[PDB]
RNA sequence: AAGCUCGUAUCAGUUUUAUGAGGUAAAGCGAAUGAUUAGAGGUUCCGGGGUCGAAAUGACCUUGACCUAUUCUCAAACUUUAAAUAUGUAAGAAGUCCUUGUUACUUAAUUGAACGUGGACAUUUGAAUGAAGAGCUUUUAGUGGGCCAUUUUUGGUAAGC
RNA sequence: GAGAACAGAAAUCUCCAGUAGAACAAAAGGGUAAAAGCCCCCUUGAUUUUGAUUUUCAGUGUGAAUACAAACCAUGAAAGU
RNA sequence: GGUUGCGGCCAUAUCUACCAGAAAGCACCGUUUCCCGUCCGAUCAACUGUAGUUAAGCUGGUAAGAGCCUGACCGAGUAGUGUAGUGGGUGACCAUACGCGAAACUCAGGUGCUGCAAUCU
C-alpha cells in the first residue's frame, strides 16, 4: 500500500550538506533567542531530539517561548482555504536568526540619520524607496571607440 | 644529524597459538607465566573453522608483551636459540621482527612432563625515543620520515650490537 | 609513505577535515558542547568554566567565559606564580596544584567584590565541603571544572586544583570520590590523608624515605632542596605560609619586560623565514627547465 | 488575468497609463499576449483626455467637459484644469499616481483602420498586435479614439 | 518472437537500465564495438568519418550489432582487416518491456523484452579512423550501415585528427612540436601542470623547443 | 439568505526590493556509488597452465586477476555542482529611541528576563499598482458518477484506453 | 600492505596505512568517529502527576513523536544527560 | 612578530617530499615511596625539574606537487526553462517572439584569518 511516515520523503532535505556532516559547530549553541525574534527553520538531519516536521523545512516565524534547550516558534500555516496558527517547538540547532529584518532595521535606523541631519538643515528629506527608474540620456563618444561591425557566420560543423 | 634517534626495543610479545583449549592451553599458558613474570593473557577463536577444530570465542591460544630490560633477556636467551642468524625476511617493513622457535626449553627452563613442550612465536617491534606522540593521548600525532624506524636502519643496528647474521638476499 | 599506500586524488578531495582545534588533539567538543552551553532561557547569562591545565610542569588555571568571538578570560593565574608567596620547588605537585586553585579562588573572588564575604575554609583539614551560599545577600561565585583531555583518576592532581578553589571560596560542585584516601571498598573518606596530599605529605614522606635508604637518588631528584637546605618536615609549613602570603594578597603582579612588545617584535622577525612572489616562483622553474632540461 | 485587473484593463479594447519602473516594467512583462501598448504622443494624450476622458469621483464615471470638474478633485495637488492634468501626465508629475488614478480607463471602440496584421495575438515584430510597439502605438490609439 | 522495432522507436519513457531492480533482463545482441586495427596508433589513421544521428530516437540492440556487423564485413574484405579502425559509440542500456499473455489488462507491468540504445539528435553512433586515402571506402561502408537503422542519420567528415580532440592542423603543431607521446591506441600531451619531476621525465623529447 | 460592527479603512490568485528554503531539468563519470568499449604500462615467495629442470622463497615465456596513468558509453529508485517556473518571511504608530519601577522566575550581583510608568521624532510615516470598501456572525440548499484541451507525466505496442 | 614455530586461502602475535569503504535487531533512507560504533563501569527515567504542541486531520479520535511544569531517582569530578 | 592555555570560522587550515627554527613556551625526557591503572608504569596515576635532547612533536619556507579556496565578456548568452501563435514537420521533432539562465571545460590569482589571557631577545 501507501507510505506516510513523519519523515518519509525528507531524502535531501534532511541530508547534511557537502563535506559538512560531523558534530554542529559551537556557535550554533551559543547563539541568544529571545520573544519576539524572527527565526528560519532548516532541520539539521544530525538533530534528532526536537526536530521539525518537514513541511516547516524553509519556513519562517517567530519564536513565542523560550526554554532550557529549545524555542517555541509559531508558524502560519495554511489548511483549507485559511491560515492555522500552528506551535512548533524547535531544538537552537534546527533555528537560525533571519536577515529578512536586517534591511529594515538597518533602513529605520539610517531613516533616524537622514531624517535628523536634514531637520536641523531645512527640512528637505524624500526617504522612502523608490523603485528602478529608466535611464535618463547620455552622449556617448566614438573617440578610441569606433563601432566594430559584425554579421552572422555561415553554418561550420566540427564535431 | 643523531641525537637521541637512538632505537630502543618498544617490547617483546611471546605468543603461543594452541589449534584448542583447556589443559593444553593454561599449559602455554602457564610456560609463558614462568617465562615472563607477568600473568599472560589469553585470546579467542575470531570466528569457527571447522578444519582447525575451533569454534568462535574459544580462548583459542596466549601471548605476552615485555618491554624494556627484562626483554631484551628473553631476546637475546631466545636470539641464542637461533644462533644469531635470521633471514632478510623477517624484517618488517616498518622496522620490527620476529622469530619462531620449537622447544620452550632450547632457551633455559626445565621440562616437566606435566606441562609438556611449546612452540614461542618471538616477535620483536623497537622503536625510538619520542615513541610517545604515536599513543599518548593529548595532541596525539605522527612522528616524522626521518626517525620512522625502518627495515635498513634496524638490520644494521642488528647486524651491530647481538653480533649476529643476517642471511639470503 | 610507500608506494602502495599513498594518497588518492580523489581520497583528499571528497575529505572532511574535524575542526583544528580537534586535528590538534587538543579540544574535546563533546564535553564542550556541554560545558559551554547554557540554558536558553538564562540569555545572556555567561557558563564560566575552572580550566585545569599541566603543562610538563608548570600548572594552569584560568577562569573562563565563551563568546562566539572567543572566549574569555575573566581571570588566570599559573603555578609558576609560586614563587611571591613560597614556593621554588615542586610546582607540579598535587598542592602547588591545591595552592594555585586556591590562589585562583582568592584573586577573582577578589576583583569581583565577594572578598571579605565568601573567604572559604581557612582551617584545612580538608573535611568534604562546598562553599555554600550566605543567609542573605550575594550567592557565592559558581563556576566549573574545565578538566579538558585529562583522565579523570580517583586521586589525580587535577582535583587537587579543584580542592584548593573550593577551599578558598569558589562554589565549584564537586563529589569527594577522586580525592586521595577516598576508600575504594567503601564510600567513605579519610581526611587525615587528603590533609596530607594538600600539605605535600607524599613528597615529605619520600623525602624521609630516602634520607636513609639511598642517598645516591635522594641527591639526583631532591636535589635543589639541598640547595637550600630544606629537608622535610619544615615542607608543611612552606606549604601553610605559601596559603597565608596567598590570601593576604592575591592581586596579581605581572612581569616587568624588559625590551618592549615592538622590541621583541624585531628580535623574532630575524629567525622567521617569508613567502616568494609569483614572479620569483616563475624564475625558479625557468632556471629549473633551463637546467634539468637542455641536456645538461 | 490579475495583472489585468490591477492595471485596471478588465475589458477589451480599453486603456491606461503607466508610469515605468521595474516594478511595473514587470507588470507589463507578464501581460504582453494581451494587450498592445507603447510610447503616446503629446498629440494623443490630448485627444484621449479631450474626447474620451472621463474622471472617478464617488466611482461614478463623471465625464470631464468643464475645468471646475478636475479642481473639484485633482486640485489638491495643483492641477486645476484639463491641460494641467495632461501636463501631469504626460510628464509624469510628482503626483502621477493621483492624477492618473483620476481618470476612468479610456474606452477605445476598435481600429478604424482594422488591426493592420492577419492575426492579433502575435508579437509586434511577429507581425502581430501585442507586445511593446514603441511609437507606434499613436497610431493605433488615435484610430480607436 | 522479437517484436518489431517500430514498437520503441521514440523515447516514451524514463531509463530503465539494468540495475538491482531490474535483474531479470536479457544479453545484448550487440557485444563488441571496436573492429578493425583497434590496436595501432594514433598517426596511423589521420582521418575520422562518423555516423551522425538527426533524430531524438531509440536504437535496437539487435539494430546495432546487425549494423555493425555489415559495415565491418564491407570496409574489411574491400578495404583490409586491418585498413581503418571502426568504433561503435553508443550503448544499449535501455531495458525495453513487454507484457506477454485468465487474466486482462491488469497489472500490467512488462518483463525484459530487449535493450535498446537512446540518441540524441547530432549524436555519433558510429566513429571510423583511417587514412585520408580510404574515405570513399569508409564512407560507403557507412552508407550501408545507415540502411540498417530506423530515423535519418547523416555521415559527416572530422576536422579533427582521428578520434582525437585535436583538429587537423592543431594536433600537427603539438606532435611536429614536443607535447605528444604514445599510448596503447591513444595518446597522452604534455601537461603544463603540476610536477615539473616527472613531466620531464616522461615526454624527454620536448624540452628544446624545436623539432 | 438574513444581516451585524465599522469605514479610509484595512484589504490583494500582481510586481518590486531584502532575506530564506528546495534537488527537478540540465549537467557529471580521466569526482564517490553503480554500470560499460578499448588498448598501454607496471606487480606477485603467491590463480592456473608450459620450456629447462633433482628441486628452489628458480629463471623464462603464458593467460588471468588486481595497481598506474589514459579511453568510448550510461542511471526513476547515483551524485560534486545545480537552474527556469513554483515557494516561507520582512518593507513601521502593534514603529524606533532615553530615562527607571514590578516579581516568588533568573543572575556572582537591581544581573537578566518579561509587563510597565515618565520622555523624544507625524504623514516621503518608510516600495509599486489597485480597492463600487473593510471586518464579523448565524442558518440552510444543491453536490459528493464527472469529462475535455495545451504543457508536465505513470501504465500499456497501442487505443476515441 | 609488511612481518612471526608447526600454521596451509582461512587460527594467533606486531606494526604501518586506513572519511568510515564498518557496525548501530529488522526494510530502506537519513544520521554518527576522543561517537550514535567496540570494550568496561555503575544502574532502572521502559518510573509518578496532569496540561500543551507536531504529523495524519474534520484541524475529531487513534497511533507515533516533541518541548516545558510538578515529583521521585540513575549516572558523572562536573557542566550535564 | 614568536609561544603557550582557551577559543571562533572549520582544508586559503588537509595530504605528499624536502629543508630551516635563536630566545622563551611547549615538548621529547628521568624516577616508582606514595593516590592510581595496567598481560606490559607503553597508555593512565603519582615524584623530580633534577640527569639529557631539537631527533621527533610544534612553527615556518620550498615544489610548472595532489587537494582546496577565489575570480573572469574562458566556455556560454550554450544546455535547460516561464510565456505566444490557426508557426514548420507524416511523425519524430524544430525554428521564431518577450523574458530567466546553468554545470563541465578553460585561464589567472591565492594556500589560514583572527578573539581573550599569560609569557619571550
Ligand atoms: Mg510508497
Ligand atoms: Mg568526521
Ligand atoms: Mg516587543
Ligand atoms: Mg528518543
Ligand atoms: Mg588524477
Ligand atoms: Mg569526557
Ligand atoms: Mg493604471
Ligand atoms: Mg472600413
Ligand atoms: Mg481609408
Ligand atoms: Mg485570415
Ligand atoms: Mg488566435
Ligand atoms: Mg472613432
Ligand atoms: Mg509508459
Ligand atoms: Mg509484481
Ligand atoms: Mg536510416
Ligand atoms: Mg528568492
Ligand atoms: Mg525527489
Ligand atoms: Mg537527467
Ligand atoms: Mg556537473
Ligand atoms: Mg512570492
Ligand atoms: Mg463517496
Ligand atoms: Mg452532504
Ligand atoms: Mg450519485
Ligand atoms: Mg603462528
Ligand atoms: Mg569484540
Ligand atoms: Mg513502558
Ligand atoms: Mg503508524
Ligand atoms: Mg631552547
Ligand atoms: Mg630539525
Ligand atoms: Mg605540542
Ligand atoms: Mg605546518
Ligand atoms: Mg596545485
Known amino acids: 500500500g501507501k507510505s506516510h511516515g513523519y519523515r518519509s520523503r525528507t531524502r535531501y532535505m534532511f541530508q547534511r550538506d557537502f563535506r559538512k556532516h560531523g558534530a554542529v559547530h559551537l556557535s550554533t549553541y551559543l547563539k541568544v533567542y529571545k520573544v519576539g525574534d524572527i527565526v528560519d527553520i532548516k532541520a539539521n538531519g544530525s538533530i534528532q531530539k526536537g526536530m521539525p516536521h518537514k513541511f516547516y523545512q524553509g519556513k519562517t516565524g517567530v519564536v513565542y517561548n523560550v526554554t532550557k534547550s529549545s524555542v517555541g516558534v509559531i508558524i502560519n500555516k495554511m489548511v483549507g482555504n485559511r491560515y492555522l496558527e500552528k506551535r512548533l517547538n524547535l531544538r537552537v540547532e534546527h533555528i537560525k536568526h533571519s536577515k529578512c529584518r536586517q534591511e529594515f532595521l538597518e533602513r529605520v535606523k539610517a531613516n533616524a540619520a ?46 | 644529524q643523531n641525537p637521541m634517534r637512538d632505537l630502543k626495543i618498544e617490547k617483546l610479545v611471546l605468543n603461543i597459538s594452541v589449534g584448542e583449549s583447556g589443559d593444553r592451553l593454561t599449559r602455554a599458558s602457564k610456560v609463558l607465566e614462568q617465562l615472563s613474570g607477568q600473568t599472560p593473557v589469553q585470546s579467542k577463536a575470531r570466528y569457527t573453522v571447522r578444519t582447525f577444530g575451533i569454534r568462535r570465542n574459544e580462548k583459542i591460544a596466549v601471548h605476552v608483551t615485555v618491554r624494556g630490560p627484562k626483554a631484551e633477556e628473553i631476546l637475546e636467551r631466545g636470539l641464542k636459540v637461533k644462533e644469531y642468524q635470521l633471514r632478510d625476511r623477517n624484517f618488517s617493513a616498518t622496522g620490527n621482527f620476529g622469530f619462531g622457535i ?31 606522540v604515536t599513543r599518548r593521548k593529548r595532541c596525539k600525532g605522527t612522528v616524522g620520515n626521518s626517525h620512522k624506524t625502518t627495515k635498513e636502519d634496524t638490520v644494521s643496528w642488528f647486524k651491530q650490537k647481538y653480533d649476529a647474521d643476517v642471511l639470503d638476499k | 609513505a610507500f608506494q602502495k599506500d599513498a594518497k588518492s586524488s580523489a581520497y583528499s578531495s571528497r575529505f572532511q577535515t574535524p575542526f583544528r582545534r580537534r586535528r590538534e588533539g587538543k579540544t574535546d567538543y563533546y564535553q564542550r558542547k556541554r560545558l559551554v552551553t547554557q540554558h536558553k532561557a538564562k540569555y545572556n547569562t555567561p557558563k564560566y568554566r575552572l580550566v585545569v591545565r599541566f603543562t610538563n610542569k608548570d600548572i594552569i588555571c584560568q577562569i573562563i567565559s565563551s563568546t562566539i568571538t572567543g572566549d574569555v578570560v575573566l581571570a588566570a593565574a599559573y603555578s609558576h606564580e609560586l614563587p611571591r608567596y613560597g614556593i621554588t620547588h615542586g610546582l607540579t605537585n598535587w598542592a602547588a596544584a591545591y595552592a594555585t586553585g586556591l590562589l585562583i579562588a582568592r584573586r577573582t573572588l577578589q576583583k569581583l567584590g565577594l572578598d571579605e564575604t565568601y573567604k572559604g575554609v581557612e582551617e584545612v583539614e580538608g573535611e568534604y565541603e562546598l562553599t555554600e551560599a550566605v543567609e542573605d545577600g550575594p550567592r557565592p561565585f559558581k563556576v566549573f571544572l574545565d578538566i579538558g583531555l585529562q583522565r579523570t583518576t580517583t586521586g589525580a592532581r587535577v582535583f587537587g586544583a579543584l580542592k584548593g578553589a573550593s577551599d578558598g571560596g569558589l562554589y565549584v560542585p564537586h563529589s569527594e570520590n577522586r580525592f586521595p584516601g577516598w576508600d575504594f571498598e567503601t564510600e567513605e573518606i579519610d581526611p587525615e590523608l587528603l590533609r596530607s596530599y594538600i600539605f605535600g605529605g607524599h613528597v615529605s614522606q619520600y623525602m624521609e624515605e630516602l634520607a636513609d635508604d639511598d642517598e645516591e637518588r635522594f641527591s639526583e631528584l631532591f636535589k635543589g632542596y639541598l640547595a637550600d637546605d630544606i629537608d622535610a618536615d619544615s615542607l608543611e609549613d612552606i606549604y601553610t ?27 623574532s622577525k630575524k629567525y622567521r623565514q617569508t613567502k616568494l612572489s609569483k614572479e620569483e616562483r616563475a624564475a625558479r622553474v625557468a632556471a629549473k627547465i633551463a637546467a634539468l632540461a637542455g641536456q645538461q | 488575468r490579475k495583472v489585468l485587473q490591477l492595471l485596471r484593463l478588465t475589458r477589451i479594447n480599453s486603456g491606461t497609463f503607466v508610469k515605468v519602473t521595474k516594478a511595473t516594467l514587470e507588470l507589463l512583462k507578464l501581460i504582453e499576449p494581451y494587450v498592445a501598448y507603447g510610447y503616446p504622443s503629446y498629440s494623443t494624450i490630448r485627444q484621449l483626455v479631450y474626447k474620451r476622458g472621463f474622471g472617478k469621483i464617488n466611482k461614478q464615471r463623471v465625464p470631464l467637459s468643464d475645468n471646475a470638474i478636475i479642481e473639484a ?50 508579437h509586434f515584430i511577429q507581425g502581430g498586435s501585442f507586445g511593446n510597439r514603441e511609437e507606434f502605438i499613436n497610431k493605433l490609439v488615435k484610430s480607436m479614439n | 518472437a522479437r517484436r518489431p522495432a517500430r514498437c520503441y522507436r521514440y ?34 589513421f589521420p582521418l575520422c568519418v562518423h555516423l551522425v544521428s538527426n533524430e531524438l530516437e531509440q536504437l535496437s540492440s539487435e539494430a546495432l ?61 558510429f566513429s571510423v579512423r583511417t587514412k585520408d586515402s580510404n574515405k570513399d571506402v569508409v564512407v560507403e561502408g557507412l552508407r550501408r550501415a545507415r540502411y540498417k537503422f530506423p530515423g535519418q542519420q547523416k555521415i559527416i567528415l572530422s576536422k579533427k585528427w582521428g578520434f582525437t580532440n585535436l583538429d587537423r592542423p592543431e594536433y600537427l603543431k603539438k606532435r611536429e612540436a614536443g607535447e605528444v607521446k604514445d599510448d596503447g591506441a591513444f595518446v597522452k600531451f604534455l601537461s603544463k601542470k603540476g610536477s615539473l619531476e616527472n613531466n620531464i621525465r616522461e615526454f624527454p623529447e620536448y624540452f628544446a623547443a624545436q623539432a
Open chain 1, 114 to 159: 537622514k531624517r535628523a541631519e536634514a531637520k536641523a538643515q531645512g527640512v528637505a528629506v524624500q526617504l522612502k524607496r523608490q523603485p528602478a527608474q529608466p535611464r535618463e540620456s547620455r552622449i556617448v563618444s566614438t573617440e578610441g571607440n569606433v563601432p566594430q561591425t559584425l554579421a552572422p557566420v555561415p553554418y561550420e560543423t566540427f564535431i
Open chain 2, 102 to 132: 620449537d622447544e620452550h626449553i632450547d632457551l633455559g627452563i626445565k621440562y616437566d612432563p606435566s606441562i609438556g613442550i611449546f612452540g614461542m612465536d618471538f616477535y620483536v617491534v623497537m622503536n625510538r625515543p619520542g615513541a610517545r
Open chain 3, 241 to 267: 605560609s605559601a596559603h597565608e602570603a596567598i590570601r593576604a594578597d592575591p592581586a596579581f603582579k605581572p612581569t616587568e619586560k624588559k625590551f618592549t612588545k615592538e622590541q621583541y617584535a624585531a628580535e
Open chain 4, 73 to 122: 478633485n485633482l486640485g489638491k495637488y495643483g492641477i486645476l484644469s484639463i491641460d494641467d492634468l495632461i501636463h501631469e501626465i504626460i510628464t509624469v508629475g510628482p503626483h502621477f499616481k493621483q492624477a492618473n488614478n483620476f481618470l476612468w480607463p479610456f474606452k477605445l471602440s476598435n481600429p478604424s483602420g482594422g488591426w493592420g496584421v492577419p492575426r492579433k495575438f502575435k
Open chain 5, 11 to 44: 523515447q516514451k519513457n524514463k531509463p530503465y537500465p539494468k540495475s538491482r531492480y531490474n535483474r531479470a533482463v536479457p544479453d545484448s545482441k550487440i557485444r563488441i564495438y571496436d573492429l578493425g586495427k583497434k590496436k595501432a596508433t594514433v598517426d596511423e
Open chain 5, 65 to 125: 550489432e546487425a549494423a555493425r556487423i555489415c559495415a565491418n564485413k564491407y570496409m574489411t574484405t574491400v578495404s583490409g582487416r586491418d585498413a581503418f579502425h571502426l568504433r561503435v559509440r553508443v550503448h544499449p542500456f535501455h531495458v525495453l518491456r513487454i507484457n506477454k499473455m485468465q487474466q486482462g489488462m491488469r497489472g500490467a507491468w512488462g518483463k525484459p523484452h530487449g535493450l535498446a540504445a537512446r540518441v540524441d539528435i547530432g549524436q555519433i553512433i
